[PDB]
């Protein structure tokens, strides 16, 4: 159970910067085993984009949580930042706040000033782990 580069290259067939997107995607899914590349429609049935869906390990108050996220890579990735969302399961609820809006969209200085090649997905996830470690984007349903 693993995704080969061939399957990835196919997903980003319509992207403007293919090799760059594939390279970073491989780097991300190798380090973060619970993130998986998925090709799905975004907003319109004709608008297919690849996203990384799954969880990332976030330490909070002495315990590690698998925070559910979805990172949509635009067809202009890595020159434009990904559009990121928290994806709560039925057992949790989104915590609207400083870094999460009403739709679950994530806001971070790293995304706001995103600039290739200094900015990348590995750096973005590292930031998320730190920021969400201070303020979780989701909490369980008590």
């Amino acid at each position: 159970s693993a995704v080969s580069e061939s399957q990835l290259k196919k997903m980003v067939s319509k992207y403007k910067y293919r090799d760059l997107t594939v390279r970073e995607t491989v780097n991300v899914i190798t380090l973060y085993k619970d993130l998986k590349p998925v090709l799905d429609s975004y907003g319109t049935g004709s608008r297919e984009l690849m996203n990384l869906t799954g969880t990332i390990p976030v330490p909070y108050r002495g315990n590690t949580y698998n925070i559910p996220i979805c990172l949509w890579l635009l067809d202009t990735y890595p020159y434009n930042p990904p559009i990121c969302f928290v994806k709560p399961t039925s057992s949790m609820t989104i915590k609207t706040g400083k870094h999460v809006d009403a739709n679950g969209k994530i806001y971070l200085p790293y995304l706001h000033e995103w600039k290739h090649p200094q900015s990348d997905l590995l750096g973005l996830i590292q930031v998320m782990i730190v920021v969400f470690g201070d303020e979780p984007p989701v909490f369980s349903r008590p």
Binding site: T55, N63, I67, K87, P88, M92, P136, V138, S140
Partner: peptide, 9 residues
């Protein structure tokens, strides 16, 4: 492996 979240606090 499985999505988890901390309790309110």
């Amino acid at each position: 492996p499985e999505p988890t979240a901390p309790p309110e606090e």
